[PDB]
Amino acid sequence: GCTMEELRSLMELRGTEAVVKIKETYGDTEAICRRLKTSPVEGLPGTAPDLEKRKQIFGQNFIPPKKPKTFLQLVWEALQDVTLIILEIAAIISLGLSFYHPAGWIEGAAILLSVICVVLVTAFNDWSKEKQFRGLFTVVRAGQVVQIPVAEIVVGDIAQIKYGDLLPADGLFIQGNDLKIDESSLTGESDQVRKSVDKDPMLLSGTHVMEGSGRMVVTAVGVNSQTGIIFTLLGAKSVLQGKLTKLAVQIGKAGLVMSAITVIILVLYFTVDTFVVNKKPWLTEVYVQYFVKFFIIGVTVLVVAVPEGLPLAVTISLAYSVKKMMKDNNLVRHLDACETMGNATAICSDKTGTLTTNRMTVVQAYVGDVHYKEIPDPSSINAKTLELLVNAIAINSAYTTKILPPEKEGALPRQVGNKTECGLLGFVLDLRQDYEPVRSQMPEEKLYKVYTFNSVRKSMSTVIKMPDESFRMYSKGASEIVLKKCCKILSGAGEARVFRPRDRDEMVKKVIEPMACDGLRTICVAYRDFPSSPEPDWDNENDILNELTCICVVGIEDPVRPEVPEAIRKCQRAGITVRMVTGDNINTARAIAIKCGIIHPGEDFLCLEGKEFNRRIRNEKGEIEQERIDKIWPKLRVLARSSPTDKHTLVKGIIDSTHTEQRQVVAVTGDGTNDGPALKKADVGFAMGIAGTDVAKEASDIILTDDNFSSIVKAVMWGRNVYDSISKFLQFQLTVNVVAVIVAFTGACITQDSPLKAVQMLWVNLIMDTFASLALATEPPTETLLLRKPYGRNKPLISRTMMKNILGHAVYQLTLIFTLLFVGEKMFQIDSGRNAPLHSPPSEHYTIIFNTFVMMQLFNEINARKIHGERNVFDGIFRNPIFCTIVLGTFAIQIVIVQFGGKPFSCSPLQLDQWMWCIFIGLGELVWGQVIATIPTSR
C-alpha cells in the first residue's frame, strides 16, 4: 500500500505532533493497519509469496556487515607509493648492473631491505586502525504467538511487547497496559516515557521496555528504522599525515630531477671530451663500463636525496607520545589521533553525562528559615527537625526506589527508580545520616491509605499509624500546589508557627524565585499529626489535604560537573569555540549553557530547536544546501531537541564550510549512542570512559578514562607538543638530505667518484634518524603551549625559523666538506681518494669525509631541539636519560662501523688523532649554532 519513504517520513514525528498528523492523513490506527492489509486481531497470514513481496518492497530487517580489509591487501596498497616505486626501480637496475663483470650486490640488496621495512610498518598502522572500528535474537511476532528471529520481521507484522524486551523495529501502538519505555539510545535522557494512543503512539527501534505490556504494528524494518539510520551513518587520512605525504612526494620528485641531470651531464661531458681530443674509432667495445659507472653514480644521488625512513621516525615519535599521554587519563586508540586536538578550532559538546553528572541532586535547601545554598553540616540544625525530615522522606517514599553501589570504578551510585524521589533519597544520605533501618522498621505490609502520583494535584501522600492511635500523615509535592495548603513553618528548634500571605509571601521572591531562576525544580514536604477518627476513604481527602505542616523546600537539578567551567574558560583562551548540541528541551539546555560559560548573557547568539534548524537549512525541494548552513553555524551556540542526524548534519556543515577564511577542525565529546555518528564525523572524538555506552566507545578516537573534562585541556596541550616534536625532526632530517645532495652532485661532476656511498647513507637515513626522532620527542609539555592560536588546516609545515636553521647549518657543513674534498690530503698528510681506479680498495681520505659528515649530524641533533629562536639548546638535556643514551649509542655504533666495517661500508680504519679531528670538526657545529642564533629571522 503505502510507499516506504512515506512511512519512514512519518516515523520522524514524536508526541502529539504525530497524533494529529495521523488523524489528518490516515485516520485512526485501525485504518492505517487496513492500508497495510493486516489485521490487528488475526495477525499475519505467513504465506511465502506475501512475505517475500513485502520483503522486496519494504526491505528486510537485516543489515549486511562490511568485511574488513586484509593485511595482504593493505600491503598491496602500501606498495603503490611513488617514493617506494622509484626506490624499487633503482634497486632493480643496481642489482642488474652489478652482474656485468666485464660483493657489488650488497648496495642494491640494502635498498630493497629498506623498502621491505617501510611497507611492513605502514600496512601495520593501517591494519590497527581497521581493527579499532570492527565492532561498529527471537521475538514474539504474531497474534498467534510464534518465536521468530528478528531478521524475519516484515512491515505489517503484529508484535507483542513485554517487560525487558528490546524493540526490533519501529512501529505503532495498537493497545497496551501502561507502557513506559526508556529512550536514552535516541535522546540521551534516561526518563520513562508513557506510551498511549492519545498522547504518544510512536514506538522506536532499539529502545528498552521499562514497564507494561502491549502490541504494536511494525512500520519500518531495516536500514529505515532509527537504529538502521544510526548504523548507516557510521559507515557500516589526517591533517598532519596529508601534509607529510605532500612534502615527501615533492622531495622525491626533486631527487629524481637531480639524478637525471647528473647522469646526462656525465654522459654529455664524456662524449664531448673524448670526441674532441681522442676521436677514437666508433667501435663500441670500454664505452660500456663508463656508462655503467655513470648509472651507478646517478642511482647514488637518488638514494642520498630522498628521506627513506620518514614514516618510521613519525611512527616512533607518535608511539612515544601516546605512551606518555596515557598518564593524563587520555587513552588514544590509534596513533595519528594524538595530534589533531592541538589544532582544533571548535568543540561540539553533549550536555547530559558529559557536562553534567546525570544524577538528580538536591543542591539548595530551605529548612529552619535559613536558606542553604550549600548542603549543611550534619547535626547543624534541630535534631527533631532532622529526624522528622528523614522519617518523612523515607516513609512517604514507600516505593521500590533505592540507591545502589557504583558497581564500577570511580562511578556515582546508580538511581534505579524515579529521578525526583531518588534525589531526596540521596539528599538524606548527603546529610550524613543513614536511612536504611528507618524504612525497614515499617514493612510495606504495615501500610495504610495511599494515593500514588495523585494525578489531580501530582502530590503524593501517605499515612502511618505506629506511634499511637493518632495516625501521622506525610505528603510531598510540587511547591506551586502544596505550599498554599500549608499552615505551619517549623523554624529552628522552635515550634511551628502559623503563616499566611505576608508570612508566606516574603519567602516568595526571596527564596522561591532565586531557586526557579537557577533552573531548579522545587519540591516541598509536609506532615500532619491529628488524632481524629480514622477516615481513610480515599474519597474524603480534600478536607484532609489542608493545614499542612511544611518542613522544608528543596531544589533538585542535574548539576554541572565541578571542573567544567574552568576547563571551558581555558579552552576559550586557546582560540576554541564551544557549542552545545543536546537532545533535551531548550530551557534546561540554556540554563546549563549559562552556568557552564558557553553563552554569556550578552544576547548576540543563536539558540534553536531541531525543527527550526532542519527547516531553515533547506530549499523548496527539501534538500540541504551548504549556503544556508553558512548563515546559521557561525553564531549558533545551543542546539536543542536534536536527533543523531542533526548532530551529524551540524558537524558536517561546519567541516565543509568555506566561510570565515579559516578552515575548521572540529572535535566532538559525548557519551551516548546518539553521539555515535557525530563522534565518527568529527576530526577527533572523545568518549567518556565510565559512562560508556560502548557504541560511543568504538566510534571515538580518544577515551577519557576518568570522566574528567579537564583532561580535554590536557589533550590540547599534548597535541601542541606532538606537532612541535615532528617539526624538530623535519628540521634535522631536511638538513641531512640537502647537504648530501650538494655533495653527491658536485663530487659526481668534478671528481666523478661519489664521496658518499649508498650503504653509508642507508645507515644514516634508516637507523640513525629514527632514533634521532625518538630522542627529539622526549621534552615534557607545559601549559604555556595553551597561549597560542590554532594553526591553519593548510599551513605550510615548514616555518621561517626552520628555513633559517636548515640553510645556516648547511652553509657550515658544505664549506667544511668541500674543504676536506679538495685540500684534505695535504692537511691530514695522506694520499688522495679522488678519481680512484675501478674497483679500488677503500680510502682514509673518503672515510674521514664520511665520519666527519656523521659527527656533524650527531652534534646537530642537539641544535635541532629548539624550533623557535632560543639560544640555550642545552636546557634540560642532562635531565633526560633517553636523549643521552641514544646519542652515546649512536656514537658507539659509528665507531664500530668505521673500525670494523670493511669494504661493504667502504671504510678503512682511522687512527686516534684522525678521530679527534673528526670530533673537533663535528663539535664546531654547536658554536656555529650560537653564531647563527644571533641572526633575527624577521629579516
Binding site: 698528510q829 695522506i830 694520499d831 639560544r871 640555550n872 642545552f874 687512527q911 686516534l912 688523532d913 679527534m916 679531528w917 670530533i919 673537533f920 663539535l923 664546531g924 654547536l926 658554536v927 650560537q930
Partner: protein, 214 residues
Amino acid sequence: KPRIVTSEEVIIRESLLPVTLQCNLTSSSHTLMYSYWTRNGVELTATRKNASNMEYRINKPRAEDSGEYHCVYHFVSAPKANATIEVKAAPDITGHKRSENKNEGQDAMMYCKSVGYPHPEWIWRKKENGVFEEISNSSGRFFITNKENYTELSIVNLQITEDPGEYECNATNSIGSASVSTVLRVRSHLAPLWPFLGILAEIIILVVIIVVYE
C-alpha cells in the same frame, strides 16, 4: 744423444706480432712416444702429441709471456732432451705500495715485484733534493733482501727526522729497465694532543656563552 735444432732467441718488444718457437728432432734412433713444452719448468697445457717436430705460437707477446722455454722429448728407452729457447723482455714492475705510513719506533716494509727475463737486478734509491741517490747504511738499520723477482727494503726503529721521503726501486735487464716510487711517512707520538686541546677550547667557549646568557 738425440739432436734438436731450435729456433733463434726472440726479444719481445712493444710490437703485437705473434711469435713462433720451433723444435726439430733432427737425429733420433729412439722411439719417441711424446713431447711437450715448458716455461720455467712448468708444462704448458695442450702441448703433448706425437710432435716429433713441434711448434708454439704466442699471438699477443707480452712481458709476462717472456721466459726460459724448454721443449722436452720423451722416448721409450732414452733420457729426455730439454733443448731450451730463451724469450727476452724488458722488466715490468707489477707490484708496489703507493705509500707506507707508520709511527716512530715501529718498523716499515716496502717491496717491489717484476715480470721479465732474464731475472732483473734490483737497486734501491731515495730522492734527496730532487735527485735520486743511493741508500746510505750509516745507521745500520736498513735491510735489503733482494730476490729473483721480489725485493724488500725494511727499516727498523724509524726516526722522524730523516727517514720520511720517497724511495724508488729499479729493476734492470739487458733489454730495459723499470722503476717505481713509494712514499714513507712517519707520525709523531704527540699527534693526538693537538686536536684534544682544541676540543678543550671549544667546550670552554660554549660554557662561557651560556653562563653569560643566563
